Amino acid sequence: KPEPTDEEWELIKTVTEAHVATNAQGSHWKQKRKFLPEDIGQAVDLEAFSHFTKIITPAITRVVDFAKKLPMFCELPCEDQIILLKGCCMEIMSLRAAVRYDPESETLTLNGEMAVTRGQLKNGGLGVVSDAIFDLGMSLSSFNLDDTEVALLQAVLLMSSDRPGLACVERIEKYQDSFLLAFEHYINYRKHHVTHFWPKLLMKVTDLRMIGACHASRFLHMKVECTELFPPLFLEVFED
């Protein structure tokens, strides 16, 4: 029922714009994409691990940019900005890949260019997380999300008040509740033909947050396997 207020319509546009400006190859991702050769990532695999280390940095960096284009993120202490980014990075990157799931070739596109299979992402170091991301990919196609809806989810993941060690807990929560509200209102406006769109979308926050945690455990097992190999931003963000 309730559609978005004037103030929320502007937040919607601020968060929509931060996403489209930091999303690799914007609209052209379908035309830019180049399938990873099937000989890379069969059955740890160091040749596939190398393709993935090449795009990990730019992907972390695009999330940093997305947050910086959000005024409320910029009103925060730099020590909170760091915790928030370190919490959502793998989440936002897993949603960006998953919304570029192609059921025709069953591939996710990473960095707006590299199409990969379940197995390549799995054997290239991400192990069982690949299955989680691919599965959210399969699941999120039914919902036909637009950029605005992908952005509001990112903002909800980013504005997580429960991040270990953060100081402005109450204000981050206020910021997340603002986003959640505009989001619900925008789903109403967008008149989707799915009863209970809103709640079913929100629970995808669960999926993403598990992918976050599941990745933080895989990083302990990427360290008993493949450290001079991991790019420098990857080690900052995914360690403490």
């Binding site: 960096t61 910086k68 730099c78 760091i82 980014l85 420098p232 931003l233 900052e236």
Partner: peptide, 12 residues
């Protein structure tokens, strides 16, 4: 630790 992120966050 958070040097690159502090660079990325203070940039532009």
């Amino acid at each position: 630790e958070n040097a690159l992120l502090r660079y990325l966050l203070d940039k532009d």
